[PDB]
């Protein structure tokens, strides 16, 4: 705000952009019943992945 007569308005494009992806960030990882789940390759260790 260089001067009072300079009409010191500020645009916040970064503010919409920074959270802009975050409408999707929380919506994909932390949206479900949980976040992560392990999977195995055989029934020998399938009882340990859960």
């Amino acid at each position: 705000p260089v001067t009072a007569g300079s009409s010191s308005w500020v645009d916040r494009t970064v503010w919409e952009s920074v959270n802009g992806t975050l409408q999707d960030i929380i919506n994909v990882f932390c949206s479900g019943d949980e976040a992560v789940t392990f999977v195995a390759d055989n029934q020998q260790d399938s009882d340990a992945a859960d």
């Binding site: 705000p1 260089v2 001067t3 009072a4 007569g5």
Partner: protein, 76 residues
Amino acid sequence: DGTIFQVTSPEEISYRRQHGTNQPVNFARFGSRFIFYPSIEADTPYYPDDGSPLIPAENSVILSYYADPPEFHEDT
């Protein structure tokens, strides 16, 4: 640093006062007085008995103005 002033009216400098926050220095002509919005403090010595160049009076503001030349008073 060679900062140029510019000139304006009272009606604006007064606003500047009522809105203290100054880089574009302004000034104006109140009768026989010069006003500057920011409370500047350039300086000269008291009456010039002098005895001091003082680095051009502390390298203060400097003015460039046309002056009334002297009326002749002598043949030579």
